[PDB]
């Protein structure tokens, strides 16, 4: 089964709490790495490719069958340098960092088989959790900032087979792991079925976030999305009165360089 | 059980809170010498990794586990860097390791081809040829078996009793530090002008019970001008409002 590439839009998803500060009934303008609104998001589904990490990754899935179970993050994934393995084994959740020699087709199945990697190495640390259409939307944001691997997430009930549902919900911080390695690529680990995910990238962006009375982010404006969004951002309001507002500066960019000296 | 000095045991201590004042204050350590660190500096400074190295060695050899020192153990069994940061802790184990007739279970190396590199461990059993003639199996012609046993008697000289030694090596890498000493907390004081420090957030003000609710991951809040308005106590998950002192 050979599948084509496919893409969709991010709509208003990919916003997360940038900090642990409580705010109430205010609009807060912040600059951080965020998935742009309506950004092109790659749609995968027989698919376990290795993808770049870039600045950070927005990952989402729409599943009812518990097929997507984990991620591999690292620079090379070839046992020469350290990589972070985060896997839900349907027993516990294991997070460990090692110079693993990864398989060229890692997968899980039923649990009846665990491959993922061949050889292992001296891990810096290991964490193991306590033992334990589509109906479940799981959203994650993965960032590598100053040696710390930060994960934000949300679980939203859904009823949609073909695409991400539209709406707005902010992701909450999940973990802040002291990893200390460079991450340039990652791979998604899925279980084999026995008796559908979206990947986008974060970019430096300024957002005006709306906090409700209880400190929950209920809406946001992506300042670079549209002149109307720029107007909303400069006025620190989601309601703009009739009138003319100066929001930016039109600058012609150079495209070529000229170096001239006498012959 | 402690490992022999030749094949010493290295326990990697990471991702934890390291209580060091208890080790210094605890009784019956025959020696506790810190190189580059101090009991008044530990229990505070954060490190990336701590490596504990445990060996059983004769009392006369305790002086050899130190930076800048030489000797049979320092050179062939456990070489410590001269540029060493950490503490060497040791205590008498005469009532643990000695056995009637002599405890010969602990081995040490006397015959080695070259000096051991700092923190390098060797588990080789290869016969030392002493630079004379081919061995082709150990024989009594300038050819020796590298490992010998200790004779730890219940009654012996103090310098000949077994001692257990733990060396705590402190390692700083570019990774975020993970091993920190314990933090100390004070009692919470309300309705007074008090200087406070909640985690890394400091200030002066009056703490009162708050009627605001914060999400499980939010630790403090701010007002309309980004001035801290309330904090969630690190130990009691309640919201406290901060009123400026008049």
């Amino acid at each position: 089964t050979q599948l084509p590439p496919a893409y969709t839009n991010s709509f208003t998803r990919g916003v997360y709490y940038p900090d642990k500060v409580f705010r109430s009934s205010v609009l807060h303008s912040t600059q951080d790495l965020f998935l742009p609104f309506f950004s092109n998001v790659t749609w995968f589904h027989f698919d376990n490719p290795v993808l770049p990490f870039n600045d950070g990754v927005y990952f989402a899935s729409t599943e009812k069958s518990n097929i997507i179970r984990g991620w591999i993050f690292g620079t090379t994934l070839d046992s020469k340098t350290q990589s972070l393995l985060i896997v839900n084994n349907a027993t516990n959740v294991v997070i460990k960092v090692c110079e693993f020699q990864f398989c060229n087709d890692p997968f899980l199945g039923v649990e009846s088989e665990f491959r993922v990697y061949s050889s292992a190495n001296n891990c810096t640390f290991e964490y193991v959790s306590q033992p334990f259409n589509f109906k479940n939307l799981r959203e994650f944001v993965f960032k590598n900032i100053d040696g710390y691997f930060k994960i934000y997430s949300k679980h939203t009930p859904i009823n949609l087979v073909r695409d991400l549902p539209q709406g707005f919900s902010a992701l909450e911080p999940l973990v802040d792991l002291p990893i200390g390695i460079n991450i340039t690529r990652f791979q998604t680990l899925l279980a084999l079925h026995r008796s559908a995910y979206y990947v986008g990238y974060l970019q430096p962006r300024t957002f005006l976030l709306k906090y409700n009375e209880n400190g929950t982010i209920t809406d946001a404006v992506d300042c670079a999305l549209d002149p109307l969004s720029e107007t909303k951002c400069t006025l620190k309001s989601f309601t703009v009165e009739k009138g003319i507002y100066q929001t930016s500066n039109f600058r012609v960019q150079p495209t070529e360089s000229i170096v001239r000296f006498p012959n | 059980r402690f490992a022999s000095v030749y094949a010493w045991n290295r326990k990697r201590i990471s991702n934890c809170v390291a209580d060091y004042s208890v080790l210094y204050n605890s009784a019956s350590f025959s020696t506790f010498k810190c190189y580059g660190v101090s009991p008044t500096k530990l229990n505070d400074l954060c490190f990336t990794n701590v490596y504990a190295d445990s060996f059983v060695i004769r009392g006369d050899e305790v002086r050899q586990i130190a930076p800048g020192q030489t000797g049979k153990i320092a050179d062939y069994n456990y070489k410590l860097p001269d540029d060493f940061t950490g503490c060497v802790i040791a205590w008498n184990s005469n009532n643990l390791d000695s056995k009637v007739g002599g405890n010969y279970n602990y081995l040490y190396r006397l015959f080695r081809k070259s000096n051991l590199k700092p923190f390098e461990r060797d588990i080789s059993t290869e016969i030392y040829q002493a630079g004379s003639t081919p061995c082709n199996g150990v024989e009594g012609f300038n050819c020796y078996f590298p490992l010998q046993s200790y004779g730890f008697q219940p009654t012996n000289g103090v310098g000949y009793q077994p001692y257990r030694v733990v060396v705590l090596s402190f390692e700083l890498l570019h990774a975020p530090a993970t091993v920190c000493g314990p933090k100390k907390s004070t009692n919470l004081v309300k309705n007074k002008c008090v200087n406070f420090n909640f985690n890394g957030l400091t200030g002066t003000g009056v703490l009162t019970e708050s009627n605001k609710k914060f999400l499980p991951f939010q630790q403090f809040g701010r007002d309309i001008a980004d001035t801290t308005d309330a904090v969630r106590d690190p130990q009691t998950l309640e919201i406290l409002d901060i009123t400026p002192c008049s």
Epitope: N122, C123 | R1, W8, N105, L107, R121, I123
Partner: nanobody
């Protein structure tokens, strides 16, 4: 986790004895192991040593040639085939494991695990 020694016995001068010992788990595989002896009136001394993965064996001057020591890596069992015994050979024999390489999991790689003792008598 533990080592158990066996074999031993009484022989006439010139006879032979097959001694053996074994250990549970990953004690012998990928580790060196050897033999020591202690005469009833003497301190314990080294007899021989064989590298489990290596397979070569070194012998003491009183051991080399006269008798050999071997191993089985699949059964993690050590053997000693003693021959040409003399009255001077009467002793209790022990086998023991040398410390091994670092093992990232919960292990006792650095310990020696000395056995109980196998009595060999010549008369």
């Amino acid at each position: 986790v533990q080592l158990q020694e066996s074999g031993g016995g009484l022989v006439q001068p010139g006879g032979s004895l097959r001694l053996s010992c074994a250990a549970s788990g990953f004690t012998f595989s990928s580790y060196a192991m050897g033999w020591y002896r202690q005469a009833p009136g003497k301190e314990r001394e080294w007899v021989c040593a064989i590298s489990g993965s290596g397979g070569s064996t070194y012998y003491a001057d009183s051991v080399k040639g006269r008798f050999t020591c071997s191993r089985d890596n699949s059964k993690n069992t050590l053997y000693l085939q003693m021959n040409s015994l003399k009255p001077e050979d009467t002793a209790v024999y022990y086998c023991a494991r040398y410390g091994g390489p670092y093992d990232p999991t919960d292990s006792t790689y650095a310990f020696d695990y000395w056995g109980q003792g196998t009595q060999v008598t010549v008369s």
